[PDB]
Design a protein around this ligand. Structure first.
Ligand SMILES: [Mg+2]
Lengths: 202, 83, 217, 129, 119
């Protein structure tokens, strides 16, 4: 027996999804979340800090009264499905694909938005949304790898934001935590939604 | 700022960065304010109960905002029994 | 009439936000001049400071456009600057007025010595820089007046400062840079951390969070 | 070469405070530096500072509150009488409501207001606000 | 050259979007449909739009065409993509982790996690 705790099962799933595999380079501001460098050169991320940051991000998200004020977007193809499902289940908005410049600053644009919070899969590929949000007092949550830039990143979750499995697992995990904190679903590691729904598929 | 009598004289009291203590000006559009909700014994968010943090454009552009907020949240959670 | 396109404009039109200090506290951008007109419009006065022609060389001659500088102020701690270039002087002036209204800022006024009555001068020594022009503002005793050139004097009068000493260096004949440096110096008034601000900040709900339900529609 | 250890210490603290660091290192240590730090701490512009012994000049680690706008040394140490304090304050301090000028007098190292209170002159060491 | 202008392209795209149900792959039938469901000042413009619409329909028959949003295509894509496999593609029974990951888990205290094995 010896049923695992929520954190134990969650970290097991992260290991299965390879969330702890970083790149060969580490940012000086992301070093605090890295455990150690392996002989090959790939930095190993600390899944405990990753889980704690996921908890913190879920705590921040749940405090938003209107979920429609939260915008989550992914520039890369792999995370598009993950962000779409996250928005669908958490009740927020999703922007999949290229981000239109001026969306947060051009008040006369048809796509003009004033989000209370921004969620990003990778700062490097979502630099333009982050730069625009820097001009509108918009807090930022970003899934940051070892080499991701931390500029204008309010809450950086240390995780592998390049693998489809890792991105899907991370977004599924965040959605489950937000729903559990809201109280619409049962507590624990288990959630009725299939994890593979967040995975990129040919 | 107050008068000799004791009346408030300033137009308003600007906020201060939770990490650097710098005054946040009216046109510092890079500054942000975040609310971290509190959880009960059952891991359920309690409406209206959160810790508020303010970050200035200077630190957010410097990129130390993430670590500063992490440290501040850790200390505040330890103080407030949020575990 | 007016159809707000921003949450801040919607709140201002619905009367949820009644003072400019509420916006200044959270540093929310102001993108509609109707907000300023509704909030502090009645007490605002505008003044055209300079009409500057500029020319772009073209294959078939020089294309001339006019630059309008406008200063708006309430004389009670609110001042704004606007610059607009346009083919027509009237259009340039209108755009400059709109931009100055949008760029209105709060100005902190303090005391030179004894703190009796309303503030009369800048709380502390401040300096603004635009291009090569540097403008330094120093507190002055009551009755000293505004010791400054015409342009900074007009800006200070619109800001509502009673007495101050000023010094200038650089190409002050560049009126745009002179007025911009004065505006920067005035803006820097509220950025200086003084002992009276050492008290820990007690945060309050931002307007977008306080009236989120109203803005949800 | 090293000419003013007080200048080096004050510049280090000023740069660290601008950068937003919570702690700053001062090397080498000196009793003049310690007196200056005590003067600042009395008015609350710095936190605790700890002296580290190394069988040499020593070191200091100072915690920074975030309230220090600027601290600097005045060189050369001009003679300041009790009547020149007003002029020096007008020259150096942003305002008459706050800010301190540190002087070394025969009664010890102290701020300009305490020097005025005791009617003692001396030599200007630096300033902070 | 023969390059369709923005007017022709936009008209064809909008017509296909709004009346995909009745569209055919025959130019004459498409032009009759256009005459029925649209007002085109010029017969030459009508023929050009009909031809471009026929070409766009031929491409759509192959597959998705950027700039054209079809309700049936989008709904079919959503229905297909919303499916899930019988078994989830995340094997927690066996997890091969390097010695560095073993040390990470030991530091975390999770040195007993089932299924975790060194290479
Ligand atoms: Mg000596």
């Amino acid at each position: 027996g010896r049923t695992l705790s929520t954190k134990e099962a969650d970290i097991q799933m992260m290991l299965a999804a390879e969330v702890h595999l970083g790149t060969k380079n580490c940012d000086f501001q992301m070093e605090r979340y890295v455990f150690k460098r392996r002989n090959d050169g790939i930095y190993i991320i600390n899944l405990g800090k990753t889980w704690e940051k996921l908890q913190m991000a879920a705590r921040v998200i749940v405090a938003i009264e209107n979920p429609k004020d939260i915008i989550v977007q992914s520039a890369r193809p792999y995370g598009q499905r993950a962000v779409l499902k996250f928005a669908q289940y958490t009740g927020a908005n999703a922007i999949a694909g290229r981000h239109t410049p001026g969306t947060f600053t051009n008040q006369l644009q048809t796509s003009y938005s004033e989000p209370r919070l921004l969620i990003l899969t990778d700062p490097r590929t979502d630099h333009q949304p982050i730069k625009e949000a820097a001009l509108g007092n918009i807090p930022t949550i970003a899934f940051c790898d070892t080499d991701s830039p931390m500029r204008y990143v309010d809450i950086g979750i240390p995780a592998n934001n390049k693998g489809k499995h890792s991105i899907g697992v991370l977004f599924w995990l965040l959605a489950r935590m937000v729903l559990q904190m809201r109280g619409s679903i049962n507590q624990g590691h288990k959630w009725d939604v299939m994890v593979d729904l967040f995975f990129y598929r040919e | 700022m107050q008068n000799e009598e004791g009346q408030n004289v300033d137009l308003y009291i600007p906020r201060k960065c939770s990490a650097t203590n710098r005054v946040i000006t009216s046109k510092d559009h890079a500054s942000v304010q975040l609310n971290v909700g509190h959880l009960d014994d059952k891991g359920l968010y309690i409406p209206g109960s959160f810790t508020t943090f303010a970050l200035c454009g200077f630190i957010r552009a410097q990129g130390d905002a993430d670590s500063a907020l992490d440290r501040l949240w850790q200390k505040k959670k330890v103080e407030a029994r949020q575990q | 009439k007016w159809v707000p396109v921003t949450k801040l404009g919607r709140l201002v039109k619905d009367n949820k936000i009644r003072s400019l200090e509420q916006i200044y506290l959270h540093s929310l951008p102001i993108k509609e001049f109707q907000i300023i007109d509704t909030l502090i419009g009645p007490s605002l006065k505008d003044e055209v400071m300079k009409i500057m022609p500029v020319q772009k060389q073209t294959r078939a001659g020089q294309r001339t456009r006019f630059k309008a500088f406008v200063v708006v102020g309430d004389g009670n701690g609110h001042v704004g600057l606007g610059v607009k270039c346009s083919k027509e002087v009237a259009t340039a002036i209108r755009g400059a007025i709109i931009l100055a209204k949008l760029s209105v800022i709060p100005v902190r006024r303090g005391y030179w010595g004894n703190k009796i009555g309303k503030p009369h001068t800048v709380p502390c020594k401040v300096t603004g820089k635009c291009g090569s022009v540097t403008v330094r503002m120093v507190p002055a005793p009551r009755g000293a007046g505004i010791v400054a050139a015409r342009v900074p004097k007009k800006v200070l009068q619109f800001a509502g400062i009673e007495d101050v000493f000023t010094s200038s260096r650089g190409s002050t004949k560049t009126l745009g840079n002179f007025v911009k440096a004065t505006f920067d110096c005035l803006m820097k008034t509220y950025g200086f951390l003084t002992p009276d601000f050492w008290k820990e900040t007690r945060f309050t709900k931002s307007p977008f969070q306080e009236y989120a339900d109203i803005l949800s529609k | 070469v090293r000419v003013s250890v007080l200048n080096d210490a004050l510049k280090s603290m000023y740069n660290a405070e601008k950068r937003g660091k919570r702690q700053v290192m001062i090397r080498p240590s000196s009793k003049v530096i310690i007196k200056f730090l005590i003067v600042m701490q009395k008015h609350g512009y710095i936190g605790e500072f700890e002296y580290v012994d190394d069988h040499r000049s020593g070191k200091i680690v100072v915690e920074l509150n975030g309230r220090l706008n600027k601290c600097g040394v005045i060189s050369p140490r001009f003679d300041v009488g009790v009547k020149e304090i007003e002029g020096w304050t007008a020259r150096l301090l942003p305002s008459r409501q706050f800010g301190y000028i540190v002087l070394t007098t025969s009664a010890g190292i102290m701020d300009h207001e305490e020097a005025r209170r005791k009617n003692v002159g001396g030599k200007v060491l630096g300033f902070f606000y | 050259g023969r390059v369709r202008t923005k007017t022709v392209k936009k008209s064809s795209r909008q017509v296909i979007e709004r009346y995909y149900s009745k569209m055919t792959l025959d130019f004459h039938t498409n032009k009759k449909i256009l005459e029925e469901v649209a007002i085109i000042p010029s017969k030459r413009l009508r023929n050009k739009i009909a031809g471009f619409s026929t070409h766009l329909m031929k491409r759509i028959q192959k597959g998705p065409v950027r700039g054209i949003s079809l309700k049936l295509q989008e709904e079919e894509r959503e229905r297909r993509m919303d499916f899930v496999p019988d078994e989830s593609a995340i094997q927690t029974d066996r997890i091969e982790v390097d010695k560095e990951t073993i040390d990470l888990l030991a530091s975390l205290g999770m040195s007993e996690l089932p299924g975790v094995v060194l290479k």
